Amino acid sequence: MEYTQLGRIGLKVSRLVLGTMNFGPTTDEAESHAIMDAALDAGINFFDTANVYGWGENKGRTEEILGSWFAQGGDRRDKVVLATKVYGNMGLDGPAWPNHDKLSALNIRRSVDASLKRLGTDHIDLYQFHHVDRDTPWDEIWQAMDVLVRQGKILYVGSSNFAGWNIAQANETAARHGRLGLVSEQCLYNLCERRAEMEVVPAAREYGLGVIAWSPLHGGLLGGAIRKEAADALKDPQQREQIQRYEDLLDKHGLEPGEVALAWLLTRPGVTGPIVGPRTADQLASAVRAAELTLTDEVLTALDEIFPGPGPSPEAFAW
Amino acid sequence: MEYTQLGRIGLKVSRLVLGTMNFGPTTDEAESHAIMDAALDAGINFFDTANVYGWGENKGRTEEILGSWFAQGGDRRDKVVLATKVYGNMGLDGPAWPNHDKLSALNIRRSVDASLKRLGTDHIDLYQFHHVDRDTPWDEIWQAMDVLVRQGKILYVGSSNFAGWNIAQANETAARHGRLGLVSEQCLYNLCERRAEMEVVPAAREYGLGVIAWSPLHGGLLGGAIRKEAADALKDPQQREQIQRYEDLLDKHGLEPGEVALAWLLTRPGVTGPIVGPRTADQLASAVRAAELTLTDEVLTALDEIFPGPGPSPEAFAW
Amino acid sequence: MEYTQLGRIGLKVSRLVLGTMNFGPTTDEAESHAIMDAALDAGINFFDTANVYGWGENKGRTEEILGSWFAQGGDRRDKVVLATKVYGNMGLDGPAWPNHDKLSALNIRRSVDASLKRLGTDHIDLYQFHHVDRDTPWDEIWQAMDVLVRQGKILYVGSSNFAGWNIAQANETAARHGRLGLVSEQCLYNLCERRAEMEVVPAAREYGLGVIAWSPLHGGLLGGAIRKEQAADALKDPQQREQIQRYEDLLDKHGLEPGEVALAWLLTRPGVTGPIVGPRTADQLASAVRAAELTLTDEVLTALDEIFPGPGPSPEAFAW
Amino acid sequence: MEYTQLGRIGLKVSRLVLGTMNFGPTTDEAESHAIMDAALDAGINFFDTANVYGWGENKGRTEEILGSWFAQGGDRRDKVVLATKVYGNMGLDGPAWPNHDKLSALNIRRSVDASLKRLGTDHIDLYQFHHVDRDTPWDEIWQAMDVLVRQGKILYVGSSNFAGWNIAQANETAARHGRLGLVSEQCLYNLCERRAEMEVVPAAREYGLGVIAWSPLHGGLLGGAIRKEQAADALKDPQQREQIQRYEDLLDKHGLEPGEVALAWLLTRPGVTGPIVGPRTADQLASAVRAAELTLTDEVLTALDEIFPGPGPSPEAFAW
Amino acid sequence: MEYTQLGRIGLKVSRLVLGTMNFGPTTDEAESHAIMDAALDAGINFFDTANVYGWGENKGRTEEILGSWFAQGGDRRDKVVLATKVYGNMGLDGPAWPNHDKLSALNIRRSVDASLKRLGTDHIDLYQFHHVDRDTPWDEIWQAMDVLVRQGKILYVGSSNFAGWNIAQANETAARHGRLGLVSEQCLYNLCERRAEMEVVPAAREYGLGVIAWSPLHGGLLGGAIRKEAADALKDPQQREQIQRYEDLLDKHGLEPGEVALAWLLTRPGVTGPIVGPRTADQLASAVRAAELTLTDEVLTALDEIFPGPGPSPEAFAW
Amino acid sequence: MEYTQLGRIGLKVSRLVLGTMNFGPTTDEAESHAIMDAALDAGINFFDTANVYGWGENKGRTEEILGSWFAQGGDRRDKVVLATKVYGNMGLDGPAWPNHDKLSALNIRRSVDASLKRLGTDHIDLYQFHHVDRDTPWDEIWQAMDVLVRQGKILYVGSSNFAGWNIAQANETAARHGRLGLVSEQCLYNLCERRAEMEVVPAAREYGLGVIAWSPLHGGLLGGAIRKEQAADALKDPQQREQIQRYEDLLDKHGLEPGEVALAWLLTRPGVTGPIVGPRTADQLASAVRAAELTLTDEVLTALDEIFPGPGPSPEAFAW
């Protein structure tokens, strides 16, 4: 297993991040536990979840399944970097009750307390905003997070679905009073969708955040979706031809589209690694092979032809 | 129900603030509980109280009635923005024992502890000074409030009955060391009394505080006090004629004086909204209609004729 | 002559401030010079001017008259705490060309250069904002003013016609980065108009600004206006004349001059450095000097306060 | 003429910005001067230039033309908010000698001295970075710029062609030590190219920068380019011509000029101070003045938005 | 009873400070309790003690006697401003074990914990250094005190037996990071010993500290020590004549030397008031009369003749 | 010649400080110049003056004598650490005109310009406050002094006749915004007057100021005053003469000069940079040079301390 520092900080993480979103809705408690044990034995120490994972009136379940996993002992809690999230509505879907979503100090206080209980642990390692909230100022947010830090209930703060300027404003606000700022950003980044390269990844790299790519197969579409007979891209013939060129290229070189989508992300400057969400032990073994896979300059070249990136702003749209 | 951000912060509040001052002296526990339930169902999430509410040797009772309301469950505590106050003497009326009123770190420590117990909650959402105390410096006050913030016992700090310069000094002191300053000011503001417009509301707006108007009917006087046969204004014929012109104008347009007093405040720049203190469910329904009521430019114009405002300083008295 | 510190700072000033706005429109150069020499002789060291003084097409004239006064030598410049002002349109009366009034760093730069030229001096001691500009941020303003301090062109910064909250915001912003903030506020304050008490004077006292009262006789109304019917609009209102009448009558009984009393009153108010004495002749100065030696009895102060009630500090003024 | 504050600061500017890049390559000195006088007459006070303007072996010429304009007197320098730029190679076209482009403190020093000489003025009002330099730190850049502020050589600092995150990093660094940060960003923004909306315009609004739109007609494409086939590459692409065709057709129906509409549109966007009007003759100015008096209906704005969809703010633009 | 702000802070204190040093060694528990009750009824709210009070192997006893007083209820703890001290050796007299005296963060942590237990309260209102410790830096000291402040265990910090420069250095260090600095200094100050006037009281006044005078009768010597037939001053005939002139002056005007020693201190600029240590209820009544006593300019004048002060530095020794 | 750092700073100075107050009142220009050349020759690099030196109608004369000394060239200005002072009234003896003494930014500006003119130099190395001014705030004072540092007119700032708490307040205020604080305190300190030990010398040592002792022979009393009866008021008091007698007698026994011993004693005190040697002739300098080569035995130090007991540090001096 390949390890790297999470951005500028002292924390060492596996380049694969184990996503837990299938634990509950798709994978049952017992199967989830076995996959997490297999993850540890493959050397994956970095586990990502969220309070909303489980969905519907079952939001929280994924966190509970990790909770019951830790309760078995054998150093499970101790050896994992536990990441969860705050922002999402945890009541019934539809318009949230005021301050029961987003990033007010009020919502942060209630969300973390429920998360800690469901996870059956006294501390979260990495507590991440699930989305930017432009209506809450950073002196309010950092107040909330620092309370938790001084109580020993979180160690690190991270982001998800931010613009680059939000990363800068966040970390500058934090540094002003000596606080450790965001240590990571979780952004949608894959061959089909590369606009994170304009400003999100440049900012993250400037401010020493780890970059974690979610939806690394663009919702399946990069996992061989044509060979097996997301959906909206297959109807548009422009994008369909793009994936067809993709699959044809990978047949020729004898590589799995699932695996290269992940290995490609592992080559991008600033990327810590992708989130992999296996529903089974065999989907996990396949992610581990993708982490080992070396892609040639020739393949790297042709992927860029099919899947061109926009470049950094302002060059992407000006000069 | 109309919602707005409380000044610059991430907290979302109903434009009506439910005042609780009648709960105890006028309205019994059981009736108070029903009014708070009706408030929630109308979408009011912002509840205001104070340690002194109850009065006499019954100070604290209002807080206790909210305490017993929360103890019923059904997500009552969770969905309310709970505001209370510190400053007032909680012993027998007359000269307070030293440091048993005002804003010393000593009085803040003892007042919050008693408030938390009476409210049967481990945290207050918005803890407000009831009045400025010019004898306590802001490094002392912010020490006290920050202790509470870091213990998780309060989230936000607000003010009541401050001058504009006190808001500036407060928030500047707070920002110097990274602390979130005042988020709201509760001031006496209504058609009859508009001197808050000179400096209090300008300062509040400059520093991103929500503005909350108390005594919105000027102690009844704007609620149709002539038609029904505060008192001191009715004897002075100058002010009497003012209200007479008011009531006559509102007959003509077919509007309730109770309702327009509130809707007028909802039009003023910087005003979050009025505090409404119903003693019954029907007084609450009437406040909700006032929140919906649109006042015409024509009516707005004539109210300003009858009830002229002083404008901002220094223009109000110089140029 | 009574001296005091200007607020919290090390500068000592006469409790009488020499205002110069009549120099040019009313009093010519040579007569203006005589008054300024008489002010020195009486020990008044604090001279207040403005770029706009002169009026109409002659804005700048007052500054020029001080400049020609200094050009005579004789320790004049050296003895005087020279104050002037920025904010006002120095062009044709009417709407200013953009950035040719108000408190942008652009207008500050151009306004101070023209003031230094007319005053024929290399430095202003107290450079004051004539009015608040709510569209200009304090980091902008303190940038402009700190450039001037570092070049030696000004020493101290003051205000005029601010709200209390503007004073706090100014001085907090300055202090965050080591800078000396506002040292003085020049506010409208006299027996008739007392609303500076609500928040302006409280804020100034808290931040240690001197408080300088302009229009100390309320435009002549407190200077024996009724007796000298042998301000215009005030005497037409019945209720306001009533108020002045009682004033004039009370001073008759006690054998006191209305002109001196209005200034002596201000000298009793907490945090008040002193009034602006704006002379047109040698008489205003001597009158003010007599005002400053006057001791008003508690009975007279009491009666004055019944006639001329004040609002008190806010929030109590309008609430509790 | 419509005025606004430049972002959060005290400086008032016309919503039309006079761009000068045609002065020299297209329009000669005397004709350039006529346009600048016509701009004053229309109340435009905000003039934008650059050191590189002039082109090729004549880089510097535009600055010189403004300098000769100011040398005529008549309140010209005093009325104008003068903006110019640094970053660009002022030598032979081709790879610059090291530190003779970009934003090192070394190039800033030399570039500003040459600009002040060509402009025949002792100060620039708004000194702007022409492009982001990712190899120069903000403590270096703010050192260089603060030297200039303290000497009186510039008042305000602006950017051009920055990312949103560069704006935040700049202004946070400034504010940490009291300094006034960027006051304006000059970004490429028009109906055809709307990606400034993703992060640049959001960041500018948050930090209170003015937003100045350059290439407001997308290099002439939005100025009636099809009808005037009696930008080059755009008309060759079928899909893009389709887009312009619908534009021209829609404006036919409503009786509106393409040239005026492209600017009026920008005047509706949140946080946009105004477009760069770059005249070659007196016509561009008058056209822009008409653009600024235009009220576009919600129906026209709606239709424009169907033809010319924007990305919206990031992260929603590419995710949720 | 006369009340005043304690220096610049919001805390209001009686001008008499009740010293407790006799409670234990001289006055028994029960008599001490009655004196503290009489103090409350006279309006004295400000009570001073120390961990070492009790002396010998009985150090701590005085704190315990206050502890048992509070345990009776009737709002005793609530209405008192409780002051104690840290610095002194609490083991056997002689050379202290290292870090068992002075002001290391180690000694502060152990001293406060023992003090809180003996006092049977969860917080001290005013925690005072008993002496300057020039070997401990202010970043260490303020660390220690801020820990306690954020835990809610102390409110305010004060000093005792400091030089003026130590007050300045202390408060400047505190303000640098937003912390409330020293609020009071307890110094030896009385008619016989006025060198506190050189720099200690000037500094205290500049930095808004209350000034509290200990040994206000110079160890008895100003309490009519000649009439009744400290001791070392009576043998020196120079000082003896000084007190003789004192007693003769006070016979003439018909005043008690005990009472004027205290009233004189209440006239000095910057002085909050004296510490009074009654051993009986009647010594307390006498202190209360001294607080009421007005001294004439004539008497003030002659006291200054007999007991000249050195003036401020540098004028006291240069110009 | 013995050298040391001035307190915590990088400046090296002779342990003997050349005081110049006799230059003018006692010693004329030409003789003054000879002493200053002899000081250089002995390796004394630290020269102390004041604006007020000269006395009465001749205040400024000492500064002028140094100026004419420097005008001779020969590396004189370059070799010397030049110190002078501000605070004192430079006008007619009597109550100063307001702001013409003390430490307002106004008096600092005027006082330094006049000092630079009389000294015929463009910079002062160590500019010292002659006395504490309790009515002037440290943000005011550090403003004035930082203007001068940035223009190159002074390098270092020192004090004279401060309390310990004034030193701490000064240096804490400076350090809050990066500024170098006081580097030296000049206090009255000799065998007879030892109260600087209570708090002034402790504070200076804590903040790393040099300590310069003025009046090191207590106005001549420690210079063999009794033997040279062949300070005036001291010899009249029986108890004080007793003290000096024992001093003179003890030095007889040990074969030591009173004049040299009083200075050598100061050279032993912790934190003392050195005494002010103020010469009227070449003799004071040579005497001081001999003082600095003297080693006083522990027996002599012990006896000196019995005769001349000190207070020790406060709080122990008056309490415990």
Residue numbers in the entry:
A (entry chain A), B (entry chain A), E (entry chain A): 1 to 229, 242 to 331
C (entry chain C), D (entry chain C), F (entry chain C): 1 to 230, 242 to 331
Paper text:
Aldo-keto reductases (AKRs) are a superfamily of oxidoreductases capable of reducing carbonyl to primary and secondary alcohols, found in all phyla. In this work, we identify the enzyme AKRtyl, which is responsible for tylosin reduction. Phylogenetic analysis indicates that AKRtyl is the founding member of subfamily D within family 12 in the AKR superfamily. Specifically, by combining steady-state and transient kinetics, X-ray crystallography and molecular dynamics simulation, we demonstrate that AKRtyl exhibits a positive synergy mediated by an unusual Monod-Wyman-Changeux (MWC) paradigm of allosteric regulation at low concentrations of the cofactor NADPH, but an inhibitory effect at high concentrations is observed.
To obtain the apo structure of AKRtyl, we remove the carried cofactors by denaturation and refolding. We successfully obtained two apo structures of AKRtyl without any cofactor. The second apo structure has only two active conformational (R) subunits in an asymmetric unit, by combining with other asymmetric units, we can obtain an octamer containing two active tetramers (R4R4). We didn’t get the apo structures in the T4T4 state and speculate that structures in this state may not crystallize due to energetic issues. We therefore propose that the basic unit of MWC-type allosteric ensemble is a tetramer rather than an octamer for: (1) The tetramer exhibits ligand-independent T and R conformations, suggesting that the equilibrium between the T and R conformations occurs within the tetramer.
